[PDB]
Design a protein around this ligand. Structure first.
Ligand code: SF4
Lengths: 247, 55, 99, 232
């Protein structure tokens, strides 16, 4: 799927009842100089001893984001890997009428992570019981003069206490920035339906700035929950150096 | 125990400090020298616009 | 060459963070630790949820559940070690619990 | 077989042959010196031997241990030269004991020498009849008030080398400053102690992360700035 770079990305399975997801981000160094690359593709990445894709194309493992890098001198850093983060807490409620906005206007940011959530999600009825609530929120960027939506998020669940999520985005224009997150659901007028939202904090990501000039890195970013408590042993069915062979 | 190793292969993810950078010459299934390995919390939402958390 | 010595004790400019980059790969504090007392199953149960911080090479979790005494002291109810990001407590007597 | 001309092979089989003259050349141009040309003898006119139009100055010089063996240790010839009048001494204090230089040895039958060497001339003079061998100076083994002996080695000599050579380190760059892999071409920024300088002759990299940041070259940093914590 290309030479010098690759993306892989077998999709993640949809979750059932909220819950977090542990992520395992690795970066493995192989060989020197320009190498040919994988023998086949995503079927050449073995997570413990099993290829990601079955020999027929079926996904043995879901949630893998291999990003191959050859050994070319002019490379680019492996995207999606962080190096440092700056977390600022602004925990406030988000009402239908009022958005929030914070005007980060930093200088050395690379990606933006939003920590939103809901304080509760039960839908109580008379005589008892509870049901989901269908909360909806929207994250928008300044984009000069027009607030274009970046990430709209819908949450279904029961819960009883605070639940927090996160959303990442990039492509950030220059930085007289204005971010925004606003509410879509009307409000919790009644007492039996509590669906209050909240914007706990936001994080600034600086990512990896070192494009390792001549090694061949891989990077995986696989969810670590599917595997057991044991460590993950990544293996690669690669090809070798691009030699200087006679014409 | 009785396993035989060679001088031209490795299926291990070895330590990568003061340990030189290997060289691969054609084909082969290889281990690696782990450069970074961190466990964090995955952030829901991959690309596009619509994100649904609970279903 | 008696003048060699002066060059030797002129060690280069090490970058910084002499103390060890102020981490010592010590894991940060777990975040979003929420307890939830529920009875929708027909009996009292406690669900504890938390989010994994950024760690190195892997992670596990240590849980310590204690109950408050009448004199303000504490009694150790239970201890556990896990790899999951959720836990469940059942059959708890009345009191003020700290996890 | 060696690629040598038919005239030399014809001369080799003769019962009565001419004298074999060995001409030497010391090439210190790659180490910052000059080229010297020597022959153990003068010619019949009391002049330095002229080969291919080049004069080889007379000087007592003798080589030994020349052989071609693939099995075992790499062959290490020796070259003994006169150190009367402190000539080689003058080279040892100017060229770091001549180490790293080149020694070129030519075997030529005297019948093929240039016509200027002989009073009656040379009708069979042929400047293309020579056997050439190149070696490197490894160590001036002995140097005294009388002579000087040099150890020679084949240019390959995989003695101190290792493979693979690039080493994985943190907090240190293994690239060569302003080299191909470093890929830096900016102005003078600082010296090896990170102190800022606008002097190009005092511009060197500390090989630390701060030195790379001084040049905004962190992308091309030759180190791996995470391995220091995974090795615990
Ligand atoms: S630290 Fe940066 S500037 Fe210095 S030699 Fe290495 S790559 Fe070049």
């Amino acid at each position: 799927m290309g030479k010098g770079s690759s993306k892989g990305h077998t999709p993640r399975e949809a979750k059932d009842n909220l819950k977090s997801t542990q992520l395992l981000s690795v970066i493995d160094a192989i060989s020197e100089g320009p190498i040919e690359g994988p023998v086949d593709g995503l079927k050449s990445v073995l997570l413990n001893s099993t290829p990601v894709l079955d020999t027929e194309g079926n996904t043995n493992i879901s949630g893998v984001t291999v990003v191959f890098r050859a050994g070319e001198q002019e490379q680019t850093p492996p995207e999606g890997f962080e190096s440092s983060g700056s977390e600022t807490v602004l925990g406030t409620e988000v009402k239908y009428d009022t958005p929030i906005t914070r005007t980060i206007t930093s200088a050395n940011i690379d990606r933006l992570r939003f920590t939103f959530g809901v304080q509760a999600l039960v839908e109580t009825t008379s005589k008892g019981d509870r049901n989901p609530s269908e909360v909806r929120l929207l994250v928008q960027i300044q984009r000069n003069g027009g607030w274009v939506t970046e990430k709209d998020i819908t949450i279904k669940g029961k819960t009883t206490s605070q639940y927090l999520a996160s959303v990442v985005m990039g492509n950030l224009p220059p930085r007289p920035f204005n971010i925004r997150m606003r509410r879509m659901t009307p409000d919790s007028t009644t007492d039996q339906l509590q669906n209050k939202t909240l914007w706990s904090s936001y994080t600034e990501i600086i990512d990896v700035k070192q494009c390792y000039p001549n090694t061949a890195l891989v990077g995986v970013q696989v969810d670590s929950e599917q595997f057991g408590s044991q460590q993950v042993s990544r293996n690669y069915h690669l090809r070798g150096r691009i030699l200087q062979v006679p014409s | 125990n009785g396993k035989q190793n060679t001088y031209f292969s490795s299926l291990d993810n070895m330590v990568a400090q003061g340990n030189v950078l290997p060289v691969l010459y054609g084909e082969m299934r290889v281990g690696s020298r782990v450069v970074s390995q961190e466990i964090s919390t995955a952030d829901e939402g991959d690309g596009g616009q619509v994100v649904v958390i609970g279903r | 060459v008696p003048e060699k010595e002066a060059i030797v004790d002129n060690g280069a400019h090490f970058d910084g963070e002499q103390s060890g980059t102020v981490n010592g790969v010590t894991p940060p504090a777990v975040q979003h630790l929420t307890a939830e007392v529920t009875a929708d199953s027909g009996e009292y149960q406690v669900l504890a949820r938390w989010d994994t911080p950024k760690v190195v090479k892997g992670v596990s979790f240590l849980l310590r559940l204690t109950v408050t005494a009448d004199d303000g002291s504490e009694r150790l109810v239970s201890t556990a070690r896990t790899t999951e990001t959720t836990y469940r407590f059942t059959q708890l007597a009345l009191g003020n619990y700290r996890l | 077989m060696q690629d040598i001309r038919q005239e030399t092979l014809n001369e080799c089989t003769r019962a009565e042959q001419s004298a074999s003259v060995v001409l030497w050349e010391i090439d210190l141009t790659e180490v910052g010196g000059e080229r010297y040309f020597f022959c153990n003898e003068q010619n019949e006119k009391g002049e330095p031997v002229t080969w291919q139009g080049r004069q080889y100055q007379p000087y007592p010089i003798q080589g030994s241990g020349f052989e071609l063996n693939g099995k075992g240790t790499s062959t290490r010839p020796t070259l003994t030269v006169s150190n009367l009048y402190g000539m080689v001494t003058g080279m040892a204090e100017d060229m770091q004991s001549l180490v790293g230089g080149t020694v070129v040895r030519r075997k030529v039958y005297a019948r093929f020498l240039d016509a200027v060497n002989f009073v009656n001339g040379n009708s069979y003079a042929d400047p293309e009849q020579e056997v050439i061998s190149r070696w490197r100076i490894e160590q001036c083994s002995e140097l005294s008030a009388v002579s000087a002996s040099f150890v020679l080695s084949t240019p390959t000599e995989t003695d101190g080398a290792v493979f693979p050579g690039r080493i994985m380190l943190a907090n240190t760059c293994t690239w060569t400053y302003r080299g191909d892999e470093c890929g830096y071409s900016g102005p003078a920024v600082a010296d090896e102690y990170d102190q800022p300088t606008s002097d190009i002759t005092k511009d060197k990299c500390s090989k630390c992360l701060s030195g790379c940041k001084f040049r905004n070259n962190v992308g091309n940093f030759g180190g791996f700035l995470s391995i220091n914590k995974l090795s615990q």
